[PDB]
Enzyme design. Structure first.
Site, mmCIF file in Angstrom:
data_model
loop_
_atom_site.group_PDB
_atom_site.id
_atom_site.type_symbol
_atom_site.label_atom_id
_atom_site.label_comp_id
_atom_site.label_asym_id
_atom_site.label_seq_id
_atom_site.Cartn_x
_atom_site.Cartn_y
_atom_site.Cartn_z
ATOM 1 N N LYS A 48 0.828 -1.195 0.000
ATOM 2 C CA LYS A 48 0.000 0.000 0.000
ATOM 3 C C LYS A 48 0.876 1.265 0.000
ATOM 4 N N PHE A 89 13.674 -4.766 3.067
ATOM 5 C CA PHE A 89 14.747 -5.473 3.756
ATOM 6 C C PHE A 89 14.195 -6.309 4.922
ATOM 7 C CE2 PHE A 89 17.395 -4.460 7.606
ATOM 8 C CZ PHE A 89 18.347 -5.443 7.470
ATOM 9 N N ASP A 94 12.452 -11.542 7.296
ATOM 10 C CA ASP A 94 11.550 -12.100 8.295
ATOM 11 C C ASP A 94 10.817 -13.296 7.723
ATOM 12 O OD1 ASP A 94 12.151 -10.106 10.116
ATOM 13 O OD2 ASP A 94 10.335 -8.902 9.640
ATOM 14 N N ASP A 98 10.573 -16.922 9.467
ATOM 15 C CA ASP A 98 9.274 -17.439 9.894
ATOM 16 C C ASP A 98 8.805 -18.591 9.013
ATOM 17 O OD1 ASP A 98 8.786 -15.442 11.972
ATOM 18 O OD2 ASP A 98 8.244 -14.051 10.337
ATOM 19 N N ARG A 103 3.515 -13.494 0.575
ATOM 20 C CA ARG A 103 3.608 -12.127 1.046
ATOM 21 C C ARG A 103 3.032 -11.232 -0.044
ATOM 22 N NH1 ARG A 103 4.893 -8.873 4.952
ATOM 23 N NH2 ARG A 103 6.354 -10.512 5.618
ATOM 24 N N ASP A 165 10.996 -10.925 19.761
ATOM 25 C CA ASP A 165 9.906 -11.734 19.235
ATOM 26 C C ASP A 165 10.346 -13.191 19.141
ATOM 27 O OD1 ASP A 165 7.172 -11.887 18.050
ATOM 28 O OD2 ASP A 165 8.141 -11.845 16.045
ATOM 29 N N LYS A 191 9.635 -3.587 17.317
ATOM 30 C CA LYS A 191 9.577 -4.331 16.071
ATOM 31 C C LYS A 191 8.806 -3.599 14.957
ATOM 32 C CE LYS A 191 8.460 -8.514 13.732
ATOM 33 N NZ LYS A 191 7.977 -9.886 13.661
ATOM 34 N N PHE A 230 -2.500 0.430 16.437
ATOM 35 C CA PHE A 230 -2.778 -0.084 15.101
ATOM 36 C C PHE A 230 -2.343 -1.544 14.978
ATOM 37 C CE2 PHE A 230 -3.375 4.415 13.763
ATOM 38 C CZ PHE A 230 -4.643 4.283 13.231
ATOM 39 N N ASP A 234 -4.695 -4.880 14.222
ATOM 40 C CA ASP A 234 -4.450 -5.916 13.222
ATOM 41 C C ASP A 234 -4.595 -7.311 13.821
ATOM 42 O OD1 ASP A 234 -3.496 -3.863 11.637
ATOM 43 O OD2 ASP A 234 -1.377 -4.336 12.095
ATOM 44 N N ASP A 235 -4.193 -7.443 15.088
ATOM 45 C CA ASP A 235 -4.303 -8.708 15.790
ATOM 46 C C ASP A 235 -5.780 -9.084 15.920
ATOM 47 O OD1 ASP A 235 -1.549 -8.750 15.749
ATOM 48 O OD2 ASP A 235 -1.314 -8.673 17.999
HETATM 49 O O1 LIG Z 1 -16.737 0.253 13.084
HETATM 50 P P1 LIG Z 1 -15.491 0.264 14.066
HETATM 51 O O2 LIG Z 1 -14.366 0.923 13.374
HETATM 52 O O3 LIG Z 1 -15.306 -1.111 14.586
HETATM 53 C C1 LIG Z 1 -16.136 1.357 15.366
HETATM 54 N N1 LIG Z 1 -15.180 2.433 15.584
HETATM 55 C C2 LIG Z 1 -15.521 3.729 15.570
HETATM 56 N N2 LIG Z 1 -16.788 4.125 15.300
HETATM 57 C C3 LIG Z 1 -17.081 5.489 15.285
HETATM 58 N N3 LIG Z 1 -16.035 6.377 15.546
HETATM 59 C C4 LIG Z 1 -14.793 5.919 15.804
HETATM 60 S S1 LIG Z 1 -13.378 6.720 16.131
HETATM 61 C C5 LIG Z 1 -12.448 5.403 16.304
HETATM 62 C C6 LIG Z 1 -11.128 5.419 16.569
HETATM 63 C C7 LIG Z 1 -10.270 6.114 15.703
HETATM 64 C C8 LIG Z 1 -8.895 6.187 15.899
HETATM 65 C C9 LIG Z 1 -8.339 5.546 17.000
HETATM 66 C C10 LIG Z 1 -6.965 5.554 17.295
HETATM 67 C C11 LIG Z 1 -6.475 6.746 18.056
HETATM 68 C C12 LIG Z 1 -5.975 6.520 16.717
HETATM 69 F F1 LIG Z 1 -6.354 7.394 15.796
HETATM 70 F F2 LIG Z 1 -4.948 6.217 16.694
HETATM 71 C C13 LIG Z 1 -9.180 4.848 17.873
HETATM 72 C C14 LIG Z 1 -10.565 4.770 17.666
HETATM 73 C C15 LIG Z 1 -13.200 4.324 16.107
HETATM 74 C C16 LIG Z 1 -14.513 4.594 15.826
HETATM 75 P P2 LIG Z 1 -16.252 0.532 16.969
HETATM 76 O O4 LIG Z 1 -15.434 -0.709 16.965
HETATM 77 O O5 LIG Z 1 -15.915 1.588 17.968
HETATM 78 O O6 LIG Z 1 -17.852 0.106 16.978
#
Ligand SMILES: O=P(O)(O)C(Nc1ncnc2sc(-c3ccc([C@@H]4CC4(F)F)cc3)cc12)P(=O)(O)O
Ligand SMILES: O=P(O)(O)C(Nc1ncnc2sc(-c3ccc([C@@H]4CC4(F)F)cc3)cc12)P(=O)(O)O
Ligand SMILES: O=P(O)(O)C(Nc1ncnc2sc(-c3ccc([C@@H]4CC4(F)F)cc3)cc12)P(=O)(O)O
Ligand SMILES: O=P(O)(O)C(Nc1ncnc2sc(-c3ccc([C@@H]4CC4(F)F)cc3)cc12)P(=O)(O)O
Lengths: 341, 341
Positions: A48, A89, A94, A98, A103, A165, A191, A230, A234-235
Site C-alpha cells: 500500500k 529489507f 523475516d 518465519d 507475502r 519476538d 519491532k 494499530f 491488526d491482531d
Molecule cells: O466500526 P469500528 O471501526 O469497529 C467502530 N469504531 C468507531 N466508530 C465510530 N467512531 C470511531 S473513532 C475510532 C477510533 C479512531 C482512531 C483511534 C486511534 C487513536 C488513533 F487514531 F490512533 C481509535 C478509535 C473508532 C470509531 P467501533 O469498533 O468503535 O464500533
C-alpha cells in the site's frame, strides 16, 4: 484524500529510483546489478506504501509551500522510497526466519525457484540501497547526517524487537508463559511502531529543518502510542475481522503467535481455561483453531477490545492536543485516518 | 612484530566494547540484549584479528605521537573492533548461504542448536553494532561522517561481490563456463579486497585527518592489488599448501568453488582436459578430487603461480614506491608481512 493525491507521482518516481541504483561505469558488475534490479522490482513494489507516502504527505504539511521546489519533491519521494526499501529489507528476511510461503498474495522471494537463502544477501542489498539513495540525493543537505542516523537507529530498533519476538515465540517450542502484556507492548514498540510510525514523520521533520530533540521526543510519544493501537487492531482483525475488510486471512492461531488476543486471553483465565489453550493453540487442525476462537468469544474479548479502542482514541487525541505543536495536528490525524481499517 | 605488540590491548578492549553495547535504562529489552552479548562473544572472538589490528597499527604509524592520547587510542581500538564486527556480520550470513558446518574449528553459529535461521537477525545486529559504536565513541569527531560512509560503502561493495559470487557458482548447478579470469578478479575485488585491505587502512587515514580524495585513491590502488594477490595465495595454499602451514584443509574442489586454480586450469586445456574437470570437479568422492589435483599438477600450475607471485611482488613494490607518499611505506609493507602465509 491527501494520500491518494500523492500516490501517482510517488509510484512513478520508482522508475527513477531503480534507474539510478543501476546506472555502467564498471561493466564487470553488470550481472549483479541486473540481479539488484530484479530484487527491487519484486520486493519494493506491491504494498500500500503507507509508510513511504507518509514522508511525502508530512513534507507537504510541514514545509512552507514557497519552499517546495522540484528538487525538494524529488528528495521527499526518494526518502519515502528509502522507508519502503527498509520495509523490503525487513520483510524479505523475516519471511525466511518465519518460514513464510506468501507475502502480498505471491510467493515470498526466498521461495521463488533459484533464490532460496541467496535472499539473505538480497535483503542486505535492499538495506544498502537506502544509504546509496541518501547519498545521491541528500549528501549536500544540512539534514543528511540526521537521516543516515535515523535510518540506522530505526534498523537497530527493529532488529532488537525481532530478537525479542524470536525469543518470545520459538517455532517448535510452544510456551505461553512468556506471552505477557509488558512483553507484548515491548515487541510492538521496537519491532513495528518505531519504523512504521515514528520514522516516516521524523524523516519529514528533519527535511523541513525541525531537528529539535524536544520536538522529536514529542512526535515520538504520539506516534508510538498510535503504532501500538494499530498493531493491536491488526491482531483483533486477524481473527474477528471479515477478510473482505482486512485482505489477509487470520493464521495467527495456527502459527502460535503472540497476538494481543492470546495475551489478553491468558490474563482472564481460571487455571482450567489455560489447559484448553495449551491443548489447542498452534496446531494444524481446524477443529482445534475453532475451540480457541470460541474461547476468546466466551471471554467477551471484543468487549475488551472495544473498551481498549475507546480509551486509546481518547488518549491519542489528548496526546495530539498536548504535544503536536508546533507541528500541524493533521499530520498525526491524517495518518490515523489512513491506517484505520 | 608491530601487530603482536598491539594485540594484547586490542583484545582486552573487547570487554568494554561488549559492556557498552549492553549498558539497562530500558529493562524491557534485557532478554534481547543478553542474546546480543551471546552473539558478539561467539562470533567476533576467535579469529586472528588482522583487519581490526590494521586499524590500530596504521593509526600509530599515521598520527604524530604527540597526538596519540588515551582517548585517541580507545577510538582506534573501537574502530578496529568495528571492522571485526563487519567481518562477523558477513561470515555469520555467508555460512548460512553456503551451508557451512564449521568456522574457526567450531560449529557455525546458525548450526548451533536453537539458533538456525534466527542467525539472520543476529547477523543484522552485528552490523548495527558498528554504527552504535561509531556514535558512542566518535560522534563529536570531524571524521565521524567519513567513517559512517566508509563502513556503508564497504558493506555495499562486499554484498555486490557476494551477489556476483552466488551468480557465478550456484550450489546444485555446476557450470564452469562462467569461471573466467575477468570474473574472478571482480569477485575478489568486491567480495574481499575492499573490506579486508582498503577499509582498515582508510579508517586509519580518516582518523588522522587524511581525507584527500587523491590520497585515498592512491592507498586503494595499492591495497586492492595486495588483496587480490593474498586471495589468489589462499586459493593456491588451499590445495598445494601443507595444512600445518595454512590451518584450514582444502575443500575448494568438493565445494565446486571459483578458485584461482580451476580458473587458470580452465584457460590451459585442450577440449578433452575440460571433460575430465566437468566429470570430477564438485563431487563428494575422493578419487575424483585426486584426478583434479593431478590435472592441475600436470599443467605445472605451481610454475604459473610462482610466476604470478614474482610479477605480483614487483608490481606491488612499484605501486608502493610510486603511490604511498605521503603515507609511510611501512603501513603497506607491514600489512604484507603480516598476511603472507
Ligand atoms: O466500526 P469500528 O471501526 O469497529 C467502530 N469504531 C468507531 N466508530 C465510530 N467512531 C470511531 S473513532 C475510532 C477510533 C479512531 C482512531 C483511534 C486511534 C487513536 C488513533 F487514531 F490512533 C481509535 C478509535 C473508532 C470509531 P467501533 O469498533 O468503535 O464500533
Ligand atoms: O456514523 P459515524 O460514527 O459518523 C461513521 N464513522 C465510522 N463508522 C465505522 N467505523 C469508523 S472508524 C472512524 C474514525 C476513524 C478515525 C478517526 C479519527 C480521525 C482519526 F482517523 F484520527 C475518527 C473516526 C469512524 C467510523 P461515518 O464516518 O462513516 O459516518
Ligand atoms: O616460500 P614461498 O613463500 O613459497 C617463496 N616466496 C618468497 N621467497 C623469498 N622471498 C619472497 S618475497 C615474496 C613475496 C612477498 C610479498 C608479495 C606480495 C606483494 C605483496 F607483498 F603483496 C609477493 C611475493 C615471496 C617470497 P616462493 O614461492 O617464491 O619460492
Ligand atoms: O632466504 P630468505 O629469501 O631471505 C627467507 N625468506 C623467505 N623464505 C620463504 N618464504 C618467504 S616469503 C618472504 C617475504 C614476504 C614478504 C616480503 C615483503 C615485505 C613484504 F611482507 F611486503 C618479503 C619477503 C620471505 C620468505 P628468510 O626471511 O626466512 O631468511
Amino acid at each position: 484524500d491527501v494520500y491518494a493525491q500523492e500516490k501517482q507521482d510517488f509510484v512513478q518516481h520508482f522508475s527513477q529510483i531503480v534507474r539510478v541504483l543501476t546506472e555502467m561505469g564498471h561493466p564487470e558488475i553488470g550481472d549483479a546489478i541486473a540481479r539488484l534490479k530484479e530484487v527491487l522490482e519484486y520486493n519494493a513494489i506491491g504494498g500500500k506504501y503507507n509508510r513511504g507516502l507518509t514522508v511525502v504527505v508530512a513534507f507537504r504539511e510541514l514545509v512552507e509551500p514557497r519552499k517546495q521546489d522540484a528538487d525538494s519533491l524529488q528528495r521527499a519521494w526518494t526518502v519515502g522510497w528509502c522507508v519502503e526499501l527498509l520495509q523490503a529489507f525487513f520483510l524479505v528476511a523475516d519471511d525466511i526466519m518465519d518460514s513464510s510461503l506468501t507475502r502480498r498474495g505471491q510467493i515470498c522471494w526466498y521461495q521463488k525457484p533459484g533464490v532460496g537463502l541467496d535472499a539473505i544477501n538480497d535483503a542486505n542489498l535492499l538495506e544498502a540501497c537506502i544509504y546509496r539513495l541518501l547519498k545521491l540525493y541528500c549528501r549536500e543537505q544540512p539534514y543528511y547526517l540526521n537521516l543516515i542516523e535515523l535510518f540506522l537507529q530505526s534498523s537497530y530498533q527493529t532488529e532488537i524487537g525481532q530478537t525479542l519476538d524470536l525469543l518470545t515465540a520459538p517455532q517448535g517450542n510452544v510456551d505461553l508463559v512468556r506471552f505477557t502484556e509488558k512483553r507484548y507492548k515491548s515487541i510492538v514498540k521496537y519491532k513495528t511502531a518505531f519504523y512504521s510510525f515514528y520514522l516516516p514523520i521524523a524523516a519529514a521533520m528533519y527535511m523541513a529543518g525541525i531537528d529539535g530533540e524536544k520536538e522529536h521526543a514529542n512526535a515520538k510519544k504520539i506516534l508510538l502510542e498510535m503504532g501500538e493501537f494499530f498493531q493491536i487492531q491488526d491482531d483483533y482483525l486477524d481473527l474477528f475481522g471479515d477478510p473482505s475488510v482486512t485482505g489477509k486471512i487470520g493464521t495467527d492461531i495456527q502459527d502460535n503467535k503472540c497476538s494481543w488476543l492470546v495475551v489478553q486471553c491468558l490474563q482472564r483465565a481460571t487455571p482450567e481455561q489455560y489447559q484448553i489453550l495449551k491443548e489447542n493453540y498452534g496446531q494444524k487442525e481446524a477443529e482445534k483453531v475453532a475451540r480457541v476462537k470460541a474461547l476468546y468469544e466466551e471471554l467477551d474479548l471484543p468487549a475488551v477490545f472495544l473498551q481498549y479502542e475507546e480509551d486509546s482514541y481518547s488518549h491519542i487525541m489528548a496526546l495530539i492536543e498536548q504535544y503536536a505543536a508546533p507541528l500541524p495536528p493533521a499530520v498525526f490525524l491524517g495518518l490515523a485516518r489512513k491506517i484505520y481499517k
